[PDB]
Amino acid sequence: SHMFVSEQSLNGRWTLKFFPQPAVPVMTIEGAEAANGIVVDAVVPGNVEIDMEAAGLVEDPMVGNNIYKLRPYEGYQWYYSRTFAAPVVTEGQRLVLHFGGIDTFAEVYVNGIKVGSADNMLIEHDYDITSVVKEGENRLDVIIRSSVMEAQNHFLGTLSIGNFSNEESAPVRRAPSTYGWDIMPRLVSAGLWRDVTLRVENPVTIVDANWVTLSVNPKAREASESLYLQTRLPFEMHDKVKAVITISRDGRQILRKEALMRKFANLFTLNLSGVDAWWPRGYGEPALYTAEVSLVDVTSGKIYDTKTSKIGFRTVKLELDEVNLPGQPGQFQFIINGEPVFAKGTNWVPLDALHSRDASHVEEAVQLMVEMNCNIVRCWGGNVYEDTHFFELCDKYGIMVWQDFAMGCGNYSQRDNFAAALEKEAISVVVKLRNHPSLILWSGNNPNNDRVSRQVLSRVIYEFDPTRPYLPSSRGYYKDPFYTENPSQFVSEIGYHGCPNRETLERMFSPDSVNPWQNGVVGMWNDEWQTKANRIYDDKFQGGRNDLMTNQVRIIFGEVPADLDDFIFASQSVQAEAMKFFVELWRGRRPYRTGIIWWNIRDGWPLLSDAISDYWGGKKQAFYYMQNVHHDVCCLINPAANGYMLKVDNNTLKDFEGVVEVKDVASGKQVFKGKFVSKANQMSEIATLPMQKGQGMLVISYRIEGNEYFNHYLYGEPPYKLDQYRKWVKKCGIYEL
Amino acid sequence: SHMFVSEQSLNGRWTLKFFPQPAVPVMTIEGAEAANGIVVDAVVPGNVEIDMEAAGLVEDPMVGNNIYKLRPYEGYQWYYSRTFAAPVVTEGQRLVLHFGGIDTFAEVYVNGIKVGSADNMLIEHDYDITSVVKEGENRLDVIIRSSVMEAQNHFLGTLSIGNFSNEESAPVRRAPSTYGWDIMPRLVSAGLWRDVTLRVENPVTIVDANWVTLSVNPKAREASESLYLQTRLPFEMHDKVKAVITISRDGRQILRKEALMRKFANLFTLNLSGVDAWWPRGYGEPALYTAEVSLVDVTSGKIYDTKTSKIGFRTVKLELDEVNLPGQPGQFQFIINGEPVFAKGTNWVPLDALHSRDASHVEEAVQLMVEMNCNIVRCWGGNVYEDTHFFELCDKYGIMVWQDFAMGCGNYSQRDNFAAALEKEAISVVVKLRNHPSLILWSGNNPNNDRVSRQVLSRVIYEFDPTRPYLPSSRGYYKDPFYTENPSQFVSEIGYHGCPNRETLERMFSPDSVNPWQNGVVGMWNDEWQTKANRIYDDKFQGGRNDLMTNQVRIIFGEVPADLDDFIFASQSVQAEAMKFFVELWRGRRPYRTGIIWWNIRDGWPLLSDAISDYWGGKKQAFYYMQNVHHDVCCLINPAANGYMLKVDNNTLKDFEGVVEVKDVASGKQVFKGKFVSKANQMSEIATLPMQKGQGMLVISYRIEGNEYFNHYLYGEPPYKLDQYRKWVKKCGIYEL
Helix, strand or coil, rough: CCCCCCCECEEEEEEEEECCCCCCCCHHHHHHHHCCCCEEEEEEECCCCHHHHHHCCCCCCCCCCHHHHHHHHHHHHEEEEEEEEEECCCCEEEEEEEEECCCCCCCECCCEEEEEEEEEEECEEEEEEECCCCCCCEEEEECCCCHHHHHHHHHHHHHHHCCCCCCCHCEEEECHHHHHHCCCCCCCCECCCEEEEEECCCCEEEEEEEEEEEECCCCCCEEEEEEEEECCCHHHHHCEEEEEEEECCCCCCEEEEEECCCCCEEEEEEEEECCCCCCCCCCCCEEEEEEEEEECCCCCCCCHHHHEEEECCCEEEEEEEECCCCCCCCEEEEEECCCCCCCCCCCECCCCCCHHHHHHHHHHHHHEEEEEEHCCCEEEECCCCCCHHHHHHHHHHEEEECCCCCCCCCCCCCCCCHHHHHHHHHHHHHHHCCCCCCEEEEECCCCCHHHHHHHHHHHHHHHHHCCCCCCCCCCCCCHHHHCCCCCCCEEEEEEEEEEECCHHHHHCCCCHHCCCCCHHHCCCCCCEEEEEECCCCCCCCCCCHHHHHHHHHHHHHCCCCCCHCCCCCHHHHHHHHHHHHHHHHHHHHHCCCCEEEEEECCCCCCCCEEECCCCCCCEEHHHHHHHCCCCCEEEEECCCCCCEEEEEEEEECCCCEEEEEEEEEECCCCCEEEEEECCCCCCCEEEECCCCCCCCEEEEEEEEEEECCCCCCCCCCCCCCHHHHHHHHHHHHHCCC | EEECCCCEECEEEEEEEEEEEECCCCCCHHHHHHCCEEEEEEECCCCCHHHHCCCCCCCCCCCHHHHHHHHHHHHHHEEEEHHHHHHHCCCCCEEEEECCCEEECEEEECCCEEEEECCCCCCEEEEEEECCCCCCEEEEEEEECCCHHHHHHHCHHHHHCCCCCHHCCCCECCCCCHHCCCCCCCCCCCCCCEEEEEEEECCCCCEEEEEEEEEECCCCCCEEEEEEEEEEEHHCCCCCCEEEEEEEEECCEEEEEEEEEEECEEEEEEECCCCCEECCCCCCCCEEEEEEEEEEEEECCCCEEEEEECCCCCCCEEEECCCCCCCCCEEEHHHHHEEHHHHHHEEEECCCCHHHHHHHHHHHHHHHHHCCCCCCCECCCCCCCCCCHHHHHHHHHHCCEECCCCCCCCCCCCCCHHHHHHHHHHHHHHHHCCCCCCCEEECCCCCCHHHHHHHHHHHHHHHHHCCCCCEECCCCCCCCCHCCCCCCCCEEEEEECCCCCCHHHHCCCHHHCCCCEHHHHCEEEEEHHHHHHCCCCCCCCCCCCCHHHHHHHHHCCCCCCCCCHHCCCCHHHHHHHHHHHHHHHCCCCCCCCCCCEECCCCCCCCCCCCEEECCCEEHHHHHHHHHCCCCCEEEEEEEECCCCCCCCCCCCCCCCEEEEEEEEEECCEEEEEEEECCCCCEEEEEEEEECCCCCCCEEEEEEECCCCEEEEEEECCCCHHHHHHHHHHHHHCCCCC
């Protein structure tokens, strides 16, 4: 919330004219209107493929192999055009044209006069159009050119070629996943994918309100909060404007401070009483306070500007362990408000290949994490930066955010132009997000002499966010020593394949391609299944990523099921047991293990992937398994040398008592029953259970403070029988089918 | 070989107009034609002094003191002018004006319109003149200004003044030796010293074909070769062009791979069978393979572009030792294809002061190294970068190349402008030479905080050549402890003075200046002998470098001879014994000693220097002495504590058996005869020979695999008798007089 004098939306219907980009790209209005192209109605915010599908010119890219039919448009130009009424601009005021998203390389014109040249799809773009606006009807024209073709204006270094990120992505500032990944389709797309507004500022305005938590005392309910305020202040207004700072919660005023404005930039330290600290989920309440600052004329009482946001009193420290594998990553632990927190959460991928539809999915997607009880989320660097509302939800629901700078698999340019473009991007995104309490870490996500991670991004954090840590860098049987003997205290990007629900299969695949076994030969994937797992370019081959699902089914159940529903249950049960085991293994091996960020919670396209819920919200079996091992206090079973260790993990700051009962599901015999005391913020061992004979499943039934919780442990050695496994799950009564 | 649509030569007769540079340098065509100057016929490629000498305006600078008469032209401007027919350029095609060498600061005009500004004589210059070319006769005009005068456009730091490299050389990007060195005349010169061509490119063209040897297995006859291909590819041509990669040898195809072009930049890995590794001389064959890549239309079969070059499957590592001297000079060894190689070779200096005649000397000069059996050559930083053909010869003949970035004695600018110019130069020369297997190392030749060596040049290698190492930094009696107790494992830049042959003396000097003793007083050099020493500026003085020659003759032979022919044999024998001892000393002290690069093999002006062959190809006595101690397997004698140690060195990967016989020349008495086993790639000790009485010479005769090899060892203590030494050489029968 930033109360300008006025904000007028330019969202709505525009005119979109597209045409193949000639050898000399079109950059002027005259050439854009003279170009031979097709004109359709467009929607802003949007993507050009959405407007084309509305016009009936492209088929639904979410179906079959229609994604490849968008290939020719990667070399097209896109000419947005509309008219707007000029807002009222009195003397001294400034008129700002704001684009939250321009994908990507575009020339912006107001009344035929160029006002800006854009080169980054991940950050905002503001242009002062005060001197070009006219009375009455005005013209806004944006000529976008081909992003793929922009790559050929650069010479790539050796290490920028041959990586998993496309070479076209290396020299340009766009979301690397747009060019194609293993979990994301190739849809470069284009268009104005976020809001376009007209803002009016007074000569006295708030440039930036930077809120920084300097100290927090959760027990005394105190906190010292700093406000680094920067303003535009004419000298005639010096000593005549005052800043009104207001901290409040639920309409109740906590603190109010007034200070005469004697200079454009000031630091205000607010020592607060009766305030609670912001905590991630499990460790306390996500206490948020409304922080408002206004510039008010001391005489007339005129309000020149107001900046409002919800802050959280919180400190973060990244404790790098350097005695146990100091050279290996993952040897770190987050310290929030002085307390070591164990992290459990998901990786955040694109919400949609057509990123204009991201905002409409943020609410549901964040609700998936709230149901899952994640206390952390790592926003993948192959994706765009999410908008303010996503971080607001993470503030409200107490989910810590690990933000990677937008860089993909590979090494990047060491030269001045890429550094200047990346520094401009880093300064923009940091200034935008640095006041959210959920944000806890910046990551360069990269050999260690790399100018980008070890200089440009680090230098921006040093000057513009010194209170948040910066990290310059980040599949057969789940019980393989590759997982069970992994030394990483903090593991991340750990996934497992799982077939989507049949309903999703029948919706993304053509009816002939819904069954995966082309010509009935099991193990052989038809061309549509191959595309939906994701093939980036239309190549005709057999095998690849799809062979993972089948291989995993054989390892656990001996044979691949021919029945499609039996194959879905088999594949989803493998993903469900594997993912649950990984979380239980890291939680059970505290205090050495410090966190686990799994991959991933939600797909951004109808796809066969490692996600536990698909693009249309269809939750796989893994989602419910994971849900029962993400509780604040979770009773679990880990393998032991001569049996099974029954443990109870506590990701809170309070102690708990309860009773746990483990029994074999097939025989009903009680293996253990007793009271347990789970001390706060630690793993507590209950009892070593004797080894069981053969295959089977144990059911864990525990109750804490009058609430019933359930879990299970599959013992024995695979291959198991799908029907016996099904019958174990059904008699266990925890999960459905 | 880069098959453009067409390449039309502009070499030949041009018009040259020269005039003194006024205070405001002429930079436009109008001022160039208006300036009062002299017009002569010129030849491209060439130097302006060559054109003037053809016009009878300057005397032969290679004779006497005529080099100083070119001084006034250091302040002149040079106006090249020519007409050319426009090549055929169809739609989409691009016309490129290519200059392989512009010395140096020049404004390039095509039809009166400026198309480029040049500021570096060491790299190519390409200008897209498509938009300025006209049908029919076209005009090409180049206005070069004074290089010396360009220096006064900069302010020099303290450490750039007083060094041995000229202050005029510090802020400009030219060969530092052009301004004067101890072994090179001061001839700044000017001109288009390399080819000028017109190239036509298709819209689909090859930008760069970077070949990199990823792994080699010399005994399996296998190797994995990577092709980093960058192209220009219009989007309409995406998915419609294929890359045809062809590895072959002697017209026999080894591998052919076709790949559809889906993006402009790709990495192709070629795992090859039946291929041999490239080895330096002695360690194996210089196996070269023809690597061709073409961009072919999949439908029409049209070939848009083809890039062909001869590659070599080879790996290189530089093993830096620390157990010994603290990262001191020489404490390293080259590891080629996993085998530690002992380096023996020469420093490479300018082939000509008028560098347009370099190319005409490359064949003969490389053949000097092949006759010498050098396996390495260090291209000196005071020289220009050699062209493609010189590296092709080093590929063909198995001579490793240690390339120094062009930089002279002294510290350089730490500011942005010089760093940006050097980065552009490094990027240009690295991309040009990074596909030659002979190229083995890049060197900054620089204190440890220097921006140039420890940042600009290092960052370019890190991004554009990560498979080649980068090194940020590089008497009287030859038995003085200064040499015999030198701790450098890899010695380099080690030389000894030697008077040239008499024919070179009679061709360099005036007939009265052929004898060195002015007015007959022995030891006093006339003004012409002083000039040829090289003396950069015409300052009259006695002594200097020339006193080194006489001093060495006195130490070894007690007195300098009066007869010029006896003085030549005395000075050349000193140089021959001194240089031979150095090579034998380093070869005999393996494995601690890792290499020796001596100075030098050839002169690039008619000069009195430490070279072992002069500018006109006259081999001094040292050339033949050296040739017999550069054999792949060499029997040598080193001094010992209580005698002499007969050793045999092996710079190959094979074993050799033979018989060696050592006997005193004067007497004829056998001192030793026996069989030896020279094990591969090491120094092997044969026998400790007993100490001999007084002065004399031992002759070493060894036979290996039915071949005849010879050497000798001068024993005793100087001064010797020049006649007695000559009788020893004549009775040995090895060397002539």
